[PDB]
Amino acid sequence: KKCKYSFKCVNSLKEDHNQPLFGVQFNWHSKEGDPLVFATVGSNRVTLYECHSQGEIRLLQSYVDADADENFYTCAWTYDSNTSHPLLAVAGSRGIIRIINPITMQCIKHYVGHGNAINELKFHPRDPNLLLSVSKDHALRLWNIQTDTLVAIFGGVEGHRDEVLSADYDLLGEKIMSCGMDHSLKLWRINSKRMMNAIKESYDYNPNKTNRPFISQKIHFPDFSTRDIHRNYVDCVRWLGDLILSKSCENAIVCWKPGKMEDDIDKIKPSESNVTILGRFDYSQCDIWYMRFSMDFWQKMLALGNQVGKLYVWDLEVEDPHKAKCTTLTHHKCGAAIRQTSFSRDSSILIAVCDDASIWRWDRL
Amino acid sequence: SMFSSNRQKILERTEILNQEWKQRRIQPV
Ligand SMILES: Cc1cc(C)n(-c2cc(N3CCc4ccccc4C3)ccc2[N+](=O)[O-])n1
Numbered sequence: 001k002k003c004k005y006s007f008k009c010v011n012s013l014k015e016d017h018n019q020p021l022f023g024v025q026f027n028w029h030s031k032e033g034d035p036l037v038f039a040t041v042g043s044n045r046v047t048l049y050e051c052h053s054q055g056e057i058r059l060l061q062s063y064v065d066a067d068a069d070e071n072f073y074t075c076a077w078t079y080d081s082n083t084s085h086p087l088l089a090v091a092g093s094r095g096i097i098r099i100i101n102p103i104t105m106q107c108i109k110h111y112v113g114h115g116n117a118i119n120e121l122k123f124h125p126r127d128p129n130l131l132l133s134v135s136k137d138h139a140l141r142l143w144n145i146q147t148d149t150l151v152a153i154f155g156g157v158e159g160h161r162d163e164v165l166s167a168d169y170d171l172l173g174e175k176i177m178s179c180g181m182d183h184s185l186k187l188w189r190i191n192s193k194r195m196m197n198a199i200k201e202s203y204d205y206n207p208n209k210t211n212r213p214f215i216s217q218k219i220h221f222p223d224f225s226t227r228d229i230h231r232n233y234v235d236c237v238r239w240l241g242d243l244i245l246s247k248s249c250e251n252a253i254v255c256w257k258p259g260k261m262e263d264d265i266d267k268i269k270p271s272e273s274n275v276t277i278l279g280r281f282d283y284s285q286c287d288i289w290y291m292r293f294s295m296d297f298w299q300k301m302l303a304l305g306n307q308v309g310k311l312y313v314w315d316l317e318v319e320d321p322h323k324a325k326c327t328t329l330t331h332h333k334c335g336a337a338i339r340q341t342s343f344s345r346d347s348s349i350l351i352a353v354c355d356d357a358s359i360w361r362w363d364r365l
Numbered sequence: 366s367m368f369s370s371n372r373q374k375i376l377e378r379t380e381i382l383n384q385e386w387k388q389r390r391i392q393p394v
Binding site for chain 2: 027028029030031032034035037048060079083084085086102103125126171172240241242243261278297298299317319
C-alpha cells in the first residue's frame with residue numbers, strides 16, 4: 001500500500017539556554033482527556049510544556065540542576081504505584097539518575113552507581129518502579145525505585161565492551177535489547193527464573209528490618225549477541241513486536257531478527273550465531289552520532305530527524321519499507337540537527353527537539 | 366506472512382498495555 005499520514009508545523013520555540021536538546025518525551029501515562037504534556041532535556045535543564053489548541057505550547061515549569069556542569073541526555077516518565085502521581089526520571093553526563101516531582105520540579109531522590117555518563121533511561125512497560133539505565137561505563141542497570149535498590153547489573157564477561165548507547169524493553173517487558181559503541185546488539189531476558197526472583201527479592205528488601213545491604217545480580221552473559229547487523233556504533237534500538245529496529249550511521253534503520261527467518265524469539269539459544277535482515281528504512285544526511293528514532297504507542301509510525309532539520313516519517317502498516325515512506329516534514333526555519341522526536345499518546349502531535357535549543361510542533365492532519 | 370504475524374503480535378500486546386492504561390487514573394501535570 002502507501003502512507004496516508006500528513007502533518008502541519010503549527011509552532012516552534014527556542015529555549016533561552018541555547019544548548020543542544022537531547023531528549024523529548026510526551027507523558028504517555030496521563031489519562032484520556034487530560035492535557036498533553038512533554039518534557040525536554042538539555043544542558044543542566046529539564047523543561048515541561050503543555051500542548052493546547054491552535055498549536056499553543058505552554059511553558060509549565062523549569063528545573064535547573066544545582067551542578068552547572070551537568071548535561072542531561074535522557075528522560076523517561078513514570079507514576080507512583082501508590083498515589084498515582086506522575087514522576088520524571090532524568091540523567092546525563094554526571095551518571096546520576098534524578099527522580100523529579102513534575103508538579104513542583106523538586107528532586108525527590110537520586111541514584112549514584114554508574115561509573116560514567118548515562119545515555120538512556122527506560123521504564124518497564126508493566127511495572128512503573130523498574131527503571132533501566134544504560135551507561136558509558138559499558139553496563140546496563142535495573143533499579144527498583146520503590147525500594148531504592150539496584151536489582152541487577154548487565155555487563156561483565158560477555159557484556160558490552162564499550163559504551164552502551166541505547167536499550168529497549170519489548171512490549172510485555174520480558175526482555176531487553178541493548179546496543180552500543182562495540183557495534184553489538186545484546187538480548188537480556190528478564191523473565192528468566194533468576195531475574196523474576198531477583199525482582200521479587202528487590203521488593204522484599206526492608207531496610208528498617210535488616211542491617212545488611214541489598215545484593216544485586218551481576219548478569220555477565222546475554223541471551224543473544226550479534227555484531228553482524230551494522231559495521232559501526234549502534235546508537236538506537238527498539239523492538240518492533242518480535243523484530244528489532246536499530247541504527248548506525250549508514251543512513252538506514254535496519255529491521256532484523258535473531259536466528260533464521262522462522263526462528264521463534266523465545267526459542268533462540270544464547271549461542272545462536274545467525275541473524276535475518278528483513279528490511280531497511282532508508283533516509284539521508286543522518287551520518288552524525290547520537291540521533292534517535294521513535295515510534296508512536298500503537299507502533300504504526302516511525303519517525304527520525306536528520307542533521308539538517310528534516311523529519312522522516314514511515315507508515316509501519318505498509319510491508320515494503322520503500323513504499324512505507326511518508327512526506328518528509330520540513331520547515332525552512334528548521335535547519336539544526338533533530339536529536340529526538342516524540343509522538344503524543346494519541347499520535348495527534350509530533351514534537352522534535354534540536355541542537356540549537358529549538359522545539360518544533362507538528363500536528364497530524 | 367512474517368509481516369502479518371508480527372503486526373498481530375503488536376496489535377494484541379499494545380491492546381494489553383492499552384487496557385492497563387485505561388484502568389489507571391494518573392493525576393495531571
Ligand atoms: C556536547 C555534546 C554533543 C553530543 C552529541 N553529546 C553527547 C550526547 C550524548 N547523548 C545524548 C543523545 C544520545 C542519542 C543516542 C544515543 C546516546 C545519546 C547520549 C552522549 C554523549 C555525548 N557526547 O559526545 O559527549 N554531547
